[PDB]
Amino acid sequence: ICKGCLSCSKDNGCLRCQPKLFFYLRREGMRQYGECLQSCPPGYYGVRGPDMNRCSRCRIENCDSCFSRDFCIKCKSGFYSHKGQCFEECPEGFAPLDDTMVC
Amino acid sequence: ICKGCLSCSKDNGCLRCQPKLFFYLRREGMRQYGECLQSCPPGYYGVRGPDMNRCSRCRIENCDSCFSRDFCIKCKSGFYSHKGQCFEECPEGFAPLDDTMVC
Amino acid sequence: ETGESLAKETAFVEVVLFESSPNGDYKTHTTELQGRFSRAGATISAEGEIVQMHPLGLCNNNDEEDLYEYGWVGVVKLEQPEMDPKPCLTVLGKAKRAVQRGATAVIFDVSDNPDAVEQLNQGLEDPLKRPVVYMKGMDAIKLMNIVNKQKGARARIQHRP
Amino acid sequence: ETGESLAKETAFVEVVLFESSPNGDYKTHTTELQGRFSRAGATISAEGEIVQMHPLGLCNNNDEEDLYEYGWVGVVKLEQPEMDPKPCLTVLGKAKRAVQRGATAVIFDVSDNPDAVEQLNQGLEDPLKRPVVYMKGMDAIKLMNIVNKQKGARARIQHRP
């Protein structure tokens, strides 16, 4: 393994990444180790911090691509896009737009 | 609650059942308490021990009605019945019977 | 000829309850309860998630029971003995079973069956590797309410000189 | 003027591995390892499932991280300090974070960074409620292999007079 690492230990995997890539903490049982990725894996989005770039998990019910922690760009098939979030049915206050699937 | 109990505490639910019924240990968070049932819930089968009758969970991949711990009577839609068990595809040694779904 | 027994050491059972922020952290509040270690088990600290067990959950049926994650702390409330004429297992055996099934420790409310305590300080059957604690009164009551109302709690049995 | 410090008490870290029969029971084998409690944390027994944490997993990003079940025992292996010029957190802070995220205890392999140990026996920042243990040599190595190859293990940090 150990691809993209600036430095790489046996026990922790990657520790720092090469300049352009993304740090990702793979949990695999008791283990957790570094991977340095081109782009973030499915279920994750990236954040280009000043110090380092890294992946974070989505956590938006019914999202398919997170952009940020609180913003979804592509909701699931069958779902309404509202202030970032995804809704089976569009919450009270406002209702679906004709020809569009937003609210 | 506390239906079918011969005796019934606040903290453990039913403790013993009436003669004909089935003892079932409902787990509900940290709790676990007695219920005395007419018949066992979906996902469970009953065993009429000499001492007492009680429910046990199924544990047969792709079963829908356990009879005993190691015998299924109705497998899932799409599945082959073999020596009690349920198979997507019928294991090596023998193959499906024409007009029947057994092996 | 033996004399008055050495009094049994106190088991300080700290009970932690915990809330989960959205971000990831945990605030916790703690609750100190007290019971006694018995001869039936060890006299060592132990820690794990609490899990009630019905006293008939613990029998040698040989009948395949649920896999609980290793390291749980059992809490069992015993019933008056005239409700149960003929036990599947002695209170000793129930302890022994819980361990077999992954209990790191076990705690009995005996407040409704005082005989248990002497049945556990017999120590003629083999004594366990893991602690076996007995509790009653306001402490036992406090403990049962948590079990009853809280969604999850962790128990830390502690031992001090 | 102070003198030679009192030597630090030994943390006896028992590591349990466990197999699950089909029926429900568990056989376990145990493995006694040794480290030291430090001033940075408490000097009390503790117990919980082991969870490795990458030393950069523990930073104050404010960035929402996974909820791990309360009561885990952290195991962290520190890297040579010249690999990491500028830490997000001091080793003290990393301990403090792990707890925030539900760690009942924390264990550092310091074998590749000996400064840590004195950085943890400073005790000028506030010392934690939960134990903070440091390990090295064959014991630390033994521990990392388990983490690496076993699917699950439980740690029991123990304290004796």
Author numbering:
A (entry chain B), B (entry chain B): 39 to 141
C (entry chain A), D (entry chain A): 22 to 182
From the manuscript:
Rspo (R-spondin, also roof plate-specific spondin) proteins are evolutionarily conserved from fish to humans and have well-documented roles in a broad range of developmental and physiological processes resulting from enhancement of canonical and non-canonical Wnt signalling. ZNRF3/RNF43 specifically targets these Wnt receptors for ubiquitination and turnover, hence reducing Wnt signalling responses. Here we report a molecular level analysis of the ZNRF3/RNF43 ectodomain structure and its interactions with Rspo proteins.
The crystal structures of the ZNRF3ecto–Rspo2Fu1–Fu2 and RNF43ecto–Rspo2Fu1–Fu2 complexes revealed a 1:1 interaction between Fu1 of the Rspo2Fu1–Fu2 and a single ZNRF3ecto or RNF43ecto chain. The first, extensive, area of interaction involves hydrophobic interactions interspersed with hydrophilic (complementarily charged) patches contributed by the first two β-hairpins of the Rspo Fu1 and the region immediately carboxy-terminal to the β3 strand of ZNRF3ecto. The αC–β7 loop is a flexible region in the unliganded ZNRF3ecto crystal structures and moulds to interface the RspoFu1–Fu2 M68 in the complex. Overall, the ZNRF3ecto dimer structure appears less flexible in the complex structures compared with the unliganded structures. For all ZNRF3ecto–Rspo2Fu1–Fu2 complex structures we determined (from five different combinations of species and crystal forms), the dimer found in most of the unliganded ZNRF3ecto crystal structures reoccurs. The overall assembly thus comprises a 2:2 complex of ZNRF3ecto–Rspo2Fu1–Fu2.
